[PDB]
Symmetry: D3
Subunit: 94 residues, 6 copies
């Protein structure tokens, strides 16, 4: 019979920067093994965050260039925001 099921892979990426600020942007290659049968959807969020109150909080994350083989885990802050530590969490399911 026809059914809908998903294969899900997930992970975290910790950036401990203090006593230095974290880089304004980061891109990390993530690989799926074995590759997915169909290109999965991927969502990204934050599991840990350390942001300076001296300026507004501006954080961004995304899954870029997603393929059955993997994707690029992306993060960036912008303008005057200062980020001291962060941990990205992500999950990919087809």
């Amino acid at each position: 019979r026809l059914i809908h099921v998903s294969r899900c892979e997930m992970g975290t990426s910790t950036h401990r920067c203090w006593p230095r600020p974290c880089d304004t942007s980061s891109d990390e290659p993530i690989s799926f093994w074995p590759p997915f049968e169909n290109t999965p959807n991927v969502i990204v969020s934050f599991g840990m965050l350390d942001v300076d109150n001296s300026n507004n909080l501006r954080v961004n994350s995304s899954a870029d260039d997603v393929t059955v083989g993997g994707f690029t885990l992306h993060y960036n802050s912008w303008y005057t925001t200062t980020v001291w530590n962060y941990k990205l969490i992500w999950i990919a399911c087809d």
Copy 2:
């Protein structure tokens, strides 16, 4: 044999408001196609956030009125909080 498997659907909803503040609350209808066989559980978080440091950070998100056909993706801030941009991420699995 009896096994436990999940069908998962996921997505994001970007609210680019700057140079205006984002609305205090938002509700967006999300549809599952085809509908789930059992009502799924849904969780929501933030993939991007831009909050003014002039006041405390207060952000809320939830999946309301969840059915096999879809749900209402909810967001709201409260009191003096000013949110300039945000991206909700959500995942529904049964």
Copy 3:
């Protein structure tokens, strides 16, 4: 045939503390029923957050002691951070 599928369980844990600050750390036992066939991966994030702007925002969450039977849902802030309310979201898939 050999295929990759996941069983996913998910949930939320709301901590409404205002008018008192939330405890600096929290650990909650989460049980999977029935237990997973293989130990799942678990990721945790925030669905709601209320942080005082008087100090930097420092929030942390993790899934500790993960087994097929469950895990310990962990949260903590640190240093001068004051958290008034928060809701953890988590998802475990094998």
Copy 4:
């Protein structure tokens, strides 16, 4: 993702008649527990057979009135055929 999988149930029904001939026809109610999600296809054959050479061999089997709840396991010989023993085998998959 969309995949094709089957739930299969199977069984046997032994008719030891010797020293008497087996009845010309037999119908046995078979129940599926729990019921199938979609009506399955069912095929029937013989795992054991004892037929007299005094006449031609004529044996028939079928799955009748198939539903998600079960079916009627049918057997019959015809004309001058004499059957002394037989075992039906069947398999139902959706």
Copy 5:
């Protein structure tokens, strides 16, 4: 997680020949829709058989040229065997 599951398709092919004998051999194209993801294994048997006792009983069946798209359902008797009616049953699973 890695699991083993099968998609199974099955069917029957009835040859009512009496009052003429069935052809010594038969080959019928069977199509799978949609095609299998991996080439399946296929087995064939008899659900009904009518063989003359004037000579030995010799019946053969097989699944030939099996692909993800289908296979050739084969039957044949040989030498002096006379077959008056038969029904093939088959099941293909990956």
Copy 6:
């Protein structure tokens, strides 16, 4: 969600004996690789049969000592029956 799915393995075993009669009984060890997660059900039938009309047709087949690792594929005729060739077909699903 809880669903019912099966892993199925199948095979055939050909005994070409002519010009000698096949042994009265045969037992062949069949191995499943990798082993099943739950003990499967197994059914056995005939895909090809060559029986002498000089005596009644008596053929038997069964799956004995079934475990997650395999089973013993069994066949036997009895009394005066003479079998010249046969092919067993079998399918195991959990």
